[PDB]
Design a protein around this ligand. Structure first.
Ligand SMILES: Cc1ccc(C(=O)Nc2ccc(CN3CCN(C)CC3)c(C(F)(F)F)c2)cc1C#Cc1cnc2cccnn12
Length: 261
């Protein structure tokens, strides 16, 4: 009883892309013609009402840089159907064969797209809560879109959120600064060689990751703005998006390619 509802026979599940405690992610086909991604809910693993709230949120969000809901099968077994992003998660994309060809212009453009999606989240007064490369999807032509797979990522979380539960758009901005290090290191785990307990105490003392090799200091300066201790002093996503879009003209006009960035 909804315009999003589709018949069960119009959806075909072709390849299992992921497993979870609550369900699976598949690639499949909708209406025989449209390639789609599909989230399933294991019967009895979580409240159907609880699972379907995801779909209710996605019905209200529509932006070119956010993975787009296409369809729902809303009675058990429940299915949530979205557009398909052919290159998979940004984390895997960076770690895999393509990583060797990505240089700073592609990585900054990817960051600018993610910032645009998060600027929409910001305009709509939502909060992501788990922004990191594992929750970004990549398509043809290096298109990047914000997603949420419901995946503790202390290393990506702002200290006021990790310590006190203060999750806001500004703690997402912190996470975006961490995501900038994942881009510029081709997907490495942040704070290399530190465990969670060291990270939280180190960051509280004022430690911040140093500038990654071959990364311009001006982009590390941007990371450090995202990691300001006071959340209201961090930049908006609107600002981050504009900075990254304009980066190679306004900020690094004499960038030259290196071996890795
Ligand atoms: C099937 C599916 C279902 C749902 C979602 C999904 O991301 N839902 C989502 C739910 C909430 C929010 C925002 N809230 C976050 C929390 N926050 C507290 C409130 C706001 C957002 C967001 F994108 F806006 F962030 C997204 C993605 C997929 C996929 C897929 C897929 C597509 N191509 C490929 C290729 C390879 C592997 N997977 N894959």
């Amino acid at each position: 009883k909804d315009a999003w509802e589709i018949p069960r026979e119009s959806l075909r599940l072709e390849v299992k892309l992921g497993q979870g405690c609550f369900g699976e992610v598949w690639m499949g086909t909708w209406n025989g013609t449209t390639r789609v991604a599909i989230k399933t809910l294991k019967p009895g693993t979580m409240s159907p009402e609880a699972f379907l709230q995801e779909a209710q949120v996605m019905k209200k969000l529509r932006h070119e840089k956010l993975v787009q809901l296409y369809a729902v099968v809303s009675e058990e077994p429940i299915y949530i159907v979205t557009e398909y992003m052919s290159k998979g998660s940004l984390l895997d994309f960076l770690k895999g064969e393509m990583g060797k060809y990505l240089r700073l212009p592609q990585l900054v453009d990817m960051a600018a797209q993610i910032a645009s999606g998060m600027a929409y989240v910001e305009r709509m007064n939502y909060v992501h809560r788990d922004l990191r490369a594992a929750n970004i999807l990549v398509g043809e032509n290096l298109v990047c879109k914000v997603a949420d797979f419901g995946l503790f990522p202390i290393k990506w979380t702002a200290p006021e959120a990790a310590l006190y539960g203060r999750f806001t758009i500004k703690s997402d901005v912190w996470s975006f600064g961490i995501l900038l290090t994942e881009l510029t290191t081709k997907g490495r785990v942040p704070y290399p060689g530190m465990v969670n307990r060291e990270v939280l105490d180190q960051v509280e003392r004022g430690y911040r990751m140093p500038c990654p090799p071959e990364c311009p200091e001006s982009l590390h300066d941007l990371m450090c703005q995202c990691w300001r201790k006071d959340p209201e002093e961090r930049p908006t996503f609107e600002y981050l998006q504009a900075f990254l879009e304009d980066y190679f003209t306004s900020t690094e006009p004499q960038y030259q390619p290196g071996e890795n960035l």
